[PDB]
């Protein structure tokens, strides 16, 4: 019973920019803001504006706008970052800074002499070695980059075996923090993929089920 | 039920009267016999009339 020892890892990426709000969610947020403004009890700005205006009117019959204009001009001068950094590039499929609202997953292309499978960042562990160590070595060597992969536990996430001589592809999870990639234009056709592109690219059934335990969001 | 819910639209519940004549007619034209048998059993009619 010669079982082929093989490993793998399902890389991930924490999101940065928040997700868009559904029109229903936007209406709910507006209603919540309205009810909060209605339930609030006075305010420093309101107390300093309304009472001051009333006193000025009373004195004339015998602050607020300045600060508002200052805030408006400060917000106009301060330019925020580009939130939609995907449509401007579109064709940049091999860039870590492509998608920011959804989760990203690594995607490497490898061609063999006997097969040409859409091989996910797989690995190969030694009987005397540990699966975690093998995954770390494959991430630090195959990707060729200094990354701070923050793992969670020593337990796996999904396994898929294939026979012809048995085998077994062991997967794992790893959350990045600061990935410093060297030479992005290398021969290694690495691509960053989320969910829709994952399901659209993955042709085989062994990897088609990998998306069952991935954060759909 | 779907037609009634669509016609009420939620706004009526936020206090309808609901008629009683139609309800009584439907009860008599469906599960009336069940309640009649229950009342007869409670009053003790089967244990005395037909023994």
């Amino acid at each position: 019973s010669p079982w082929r020892l093989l490993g793998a890892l399902c890389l991930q990426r924490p999101p940065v920019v928040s997700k868009p709000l559904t029109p229903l969610q936007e209406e709910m947020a507006s209603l919540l803001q309205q009810i909060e403004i209605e339930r609030s009890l006075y305010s420093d700005h309101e107390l300093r504006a309304l009472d001051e205006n009333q006193r000025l009117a009373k004195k004339k019959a015998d602050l607020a706008q300045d600060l508002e204009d200052m805030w408006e001009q400060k917000f106009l001068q301060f330019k925020l970052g580009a939130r939609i950094t995907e449509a401007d590039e579109k064709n940049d499929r091999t860039s870590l800074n492509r998608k920011l609202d959804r989760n990203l997953v690594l995607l490497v292309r490898e061609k063999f002499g006997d097969q040409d499978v859409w091989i996910l960042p797989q690995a190969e562990w030694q009987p005397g070695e540990t699966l975690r160590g093998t995954a770390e070595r494959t991430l630090a060597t195959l990707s060729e980059n200094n990354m701070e992969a923050k793992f969670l536990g020593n337990a796996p996430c999904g396994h898929y075996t294939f026979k012809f001589l048995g085998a077994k592809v062991f997967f794992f999870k790893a959350l990045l923090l600061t990935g410093d990639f060297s030479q992005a234009g290398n021969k290694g056709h690495h691509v960053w993929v989320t969910k829709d592109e994952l399901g659209d690219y993955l042709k085989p059934k062994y990897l088609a089920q990998v998306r069952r335990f991935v954060s759909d969001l | 039920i779907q037609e009634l819910r669509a016609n009420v639209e939620e706004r009526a519940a936020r206090t309808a009267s609901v008629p009683l004549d139609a309800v009584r007619a439907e009860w008599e034209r469906t599960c009336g016999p069940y309640h009649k048998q229950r009342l007869a059993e409670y009053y003790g009619l089967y244990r005395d009339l037909f023994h």
Partner: protein, 131 residues
Amino acid sequence: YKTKPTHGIGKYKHLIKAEVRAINLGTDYEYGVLNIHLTAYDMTLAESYAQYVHNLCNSLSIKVEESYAMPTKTIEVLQLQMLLDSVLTTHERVVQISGLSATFAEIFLEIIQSSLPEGVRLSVKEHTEED
């Protein structure tokens, strides 16, 4: 009664338990009261996040011993350039968890990472502290 066959029918003390280390055996593993501090600047956001975490723990059959909240730290920062005051505040809420077994911790961590709000960090550690 004792001799009668109906003995021990009204026994209820044996069902109620009217009376932390990190056990790590070979197969079973349980952490030692993990404290999840929800550091954030907004109070409503932190409260909602704590409520959601407690609801998830209750739905997944997870014990939640304590759930107190830490005091606020009035961090007074002087915006230098012109002296402009800005008395900010950092709120923190703790949520104790003990019921965990193998992949349950990973599932909970994944759920947390997937359901993160805007402007709320994390910092899990042991309970050994001084409030």
